[PDB]
């Protein structure tokens, strides 16, 4: 069940690197930074805890008004 991660930065941690990057290249899937393990490698705020108010305002002011 851990191999069904839509993200590639969170799937390249435990799985093979050349196996996830090759599939993500030929597919061209634009992956977002939603979740908890994605923002750790990137370096952004974590939505869990006090960081939920930050991601809520970021998604509200994005093509929504």
């Amino acid at each position: 069940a851990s191999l069904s991660t839509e993200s590639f930065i969170s799937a390249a941690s435990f799985q093979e690197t050349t196996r996830v990057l090759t599939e993500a290249a030929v597919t061209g899937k634009r992956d977002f930074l939603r979740g908890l393990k994605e923002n750790v490698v990137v370096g952004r705020l974590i939505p869990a805890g006090t960081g939920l108010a930050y991601h809520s305002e970021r998604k509200r002011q994005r093509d929504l008004g």
Binding site: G49, T50, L52, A53
Partner: protein
């Protein structure tokens, strides 16, 4: 006359909006923009913001109103 960090958490029952409310309030006291309602007891700006949450003197409306005024 002591720190009350447990009584203020039961009012909001979230422990997350209290940190966001105390962050925006502590920056107004460290930069010298506003004056605190509770008197100073030789405390720092982070612990004095939690004293106003338990007393009910400040809320999410007073912090938003203290930024437009000057």
């Amino acid at each position: 006359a002591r720190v009350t960090v447990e009584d203020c958490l039961d009012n909001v029952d979230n422990r997350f909006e209290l940190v966001m409310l105390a962050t925006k309030r502590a920056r107004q006291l460290a930069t010298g923009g506003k004056e605190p309602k509770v008197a100073w007891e030789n405390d720092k700006p982070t612990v004095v913001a939690l004293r106003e949450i338990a007393s009910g003197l400040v809320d999410e409306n007073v912090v938003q109103q203290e930024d437009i005024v000057e």
